Amino acid sequence: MDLEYMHISYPNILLNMRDGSKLRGYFAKKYIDEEIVHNHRDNAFVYKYPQIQFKIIDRSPLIIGIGSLGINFLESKRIFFEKELIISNDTNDITEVNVHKDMDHFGTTDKILKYQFKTPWMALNAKNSEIYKNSDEIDREEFLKRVLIGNILSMSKSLGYTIEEKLKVKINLKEVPVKFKNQNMVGFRGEFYINFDIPQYLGIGRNVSRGFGTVVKV
Template structure:
C-alpha cells in the first residue's frame, strides 16, 4: 500500500500545476472525491481517472521511459491507457464487488461506536457507512441518486500500517444494487489506493 502513496507523490510533484492530480490548491487541501487515484493492482502501478480525471490522464498521456520515486528509478517496459464508459447508479441487477485493497471505513467520530457495538450493530454501522461512501462519490460526480441503495456486506477487520500507525481496515466484499466503476475507491484515503473495488462475476 505504501507504493500507491509513493506513486501519488511522484505524479503530484511532476504535475503540481494540475489540481486534479493531487487535490491541493493555493489555500491547502481540496476536500472532494479524488478524480485521479493511484494504486498498485496485482503488482501493476496504476493511475485511475474518472470524469475530468480520466480526460486529464488522456491529455497528459504516459510518455516516460522511467519514473523516479524517492531516488529509485523504475524502467517502464510497457505502459498502456484503457478507457471505458459505464453506467453509474442504481440498477435492477445485484452487483458483487471485492475490495482489492483494504477499506478504511472508520474515522475518529465512529470508531468508538464501532468498538462498543455488538456483531449485528457493527454490520449495520458498516453498511450505513458504505452507503454513505457511495453517496459521497456520487455527489462529487454530480450524480443525483433518487432510488434506495441496498448493500449486503461480507467483510472482516484487519490491521493496516498507514503513515507509521496501526489503522483499522476491512477486507472482503459486498453486494449492491449500485453499479460502480472498477478500480475506484470507497472510504478514506482512496487517492492513495485504499478501498479499491472490483466487480465479480455472480
C-alpha cells in the same frame, strides 16, 4: 448515467503495497502544477472525490482518471508515454504500458451486483473509529453497512449523480490493519452486494486517492 474512464497500467514495474502512497507521491512533485493529482488548493485541502487515483494492483501500478476532467488531464499531459517512475528512492524505467479507456454504466440498478475489495477499505473516520471499537459484532456489521451507503452517497454526489431510489447492502467483511500517516488505523477486506453500479477499480471510503477501497465486479 454514463461515466467516461481511462485506466493506465505499467505492468513491468512491480512494487509492494502500499507504495500507492509513494506512487501518488512521485506524481505529486512532477505535477504540482495541475492539481487533480496532488489534490491541494490555496494550501488548503480540496474536499471532493478524487478523479485521479493511484492504486497498486496485481502487483503493478495503476492510474485511474475519471470523467472528462480526469481523462483530459491524463491525455493533455502525456502520462501514458511517461519517462521513468521513482519510488523511495529506487528508479524503475517504464518500458511497457497498457492504457484502457471506455465509458460504462454508473447508477442505481434494480438488479443486485457483487463487488470485491482489491485493497483495504478504511471506512472509519475519527469519530467512527471510536464507535466501532466499543461495539459488539452484530452491531459492528450494522454500522459498516451504514458507512458504505454513505460512501456511495458521498462519491456519487461529487460526480453529479443524485440518487432517487433506495440503496441496500450486504457485507461479508473481515477486519485488517492499515498503517497510514504513522498511525495504525483499521481497514477491511472482503465482499459486498449492492443495487448500485460501480465501474471497475473505482475507490470508495477514505483516502481513495492513495488506492484504498478499490472495487471490482464479480
